[PDB]
Amino acid sequence: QCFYNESIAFFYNRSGKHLATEWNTVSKLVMGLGITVCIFIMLANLLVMVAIYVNRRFHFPIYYLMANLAAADFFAGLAYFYLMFNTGPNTRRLTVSTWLLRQGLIDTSLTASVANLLAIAIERHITVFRMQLHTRMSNRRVVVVIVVIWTMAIVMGAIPSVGWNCICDIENCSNMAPLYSDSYLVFWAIFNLVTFVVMVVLYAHIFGYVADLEDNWETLNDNLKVIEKADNAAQVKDALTKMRAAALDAQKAMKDFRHGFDILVGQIDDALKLANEGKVKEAQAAAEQLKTTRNAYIQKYLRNRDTMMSLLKTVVIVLGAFIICWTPGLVLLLLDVCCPQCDVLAYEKFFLLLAEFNSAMNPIIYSYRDKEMSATFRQILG
- Taking the complex as a whole, the smallest distance from the CB of residue 89 to ligand 1WV amounts, in Å, to 23
305, burial (CB in 10 Å: exposed 0-12, middle 13-18, buried 19+) = middle
Instruction: Please tell me whether residue 146 binds ligand 1WV under the rule CB under 6 A.
Output: no
Positions 187 through 216 that interact with ligand 1WV (CB under 6 A):
none
Instruction: Please tell me whether residue 104 binds ligand 1WV under the rule CB under 6 A.
Output: yes
Based on CB atoms, which residue is closest to ligand 1WV, 11 or 366? 11
- Taking the complex as a whole, the smallest distance from the CB of residue 347 to ligand ON9 amounts, in Å, to 8
Based on CB atoms, which residue is closest to ligand 1WV, 151 or 310? 151
- DSSP codes of every residue in 140-156: HHHHHHHHHHHHHHHHH
| Sequence-ordered list of residues with C-beta below 8 angstroms from that of 79, at least 6 positions apart, any chain | 102, 105, 106, 108, 109
164, burial (CB in 10 Å: exposed 0-12, middle 13-18, buried 19+) = middle
Based on CB atoms, which residue is closest to ligand 1WV, 150 or 366? 150
Exactly one of 27, 161, 183, 367 binds ligand 1WV (CB under 6 A); which one? 161
Sign of CA dihedral 317, 202, 127, 108: negative
- DSSP codes of every residue in 345-381: --TTHHHHHHHHHHHHHHHHHHHHH-HHHHHHHHHHH
Instruction: Please tell me whether residue 178 binds ligand 1WV under the rule CB under 6 A.
Output: no
- Taking the complex as a whole, the smallest distance from the CB of residue 256 to ligand ON9 amounts, in Å, to 45
Instruction: Please tell me whether residue 157 binds ligand 1WV under the rule CB under 6 A.
Output: yes
- DSSP codes of every residue in 292-355: HHHTTTTTTTHHHHHHHHHHHHHHHHHHHHHHHHHHHHHHHHHHHHH-SSSS---TTHHHHHHH
Q: Kindly list the residues in this chain that would bind ligand ON9 in the complex (CB under 6 A).
A: 30, 83, 87, 91, 103, 106-107, 110, 176-177, 188, 326, 329-330, 332-333, 348-349, 351-352, 355
Q: Which of ligand 1WV, ligand ON9, none is residue 351 near (CB under 5 to 8 Å by kind)?
A: ligand ON9
- Taking the complex as a whole, the smallest distance from the CB of residue 78 to ligand 1WV amounts, in Å, to 10
Q: Which of ligand ON9, ligand 1WV, none is residue 66 near (CB under 5 to 8 Å by kind)?
A: none
Based on CB atoms, which residue is closest to ligand 1WV, 72 or 105? 105
Other CB atoms within 10 A of residue 45 CB: 23
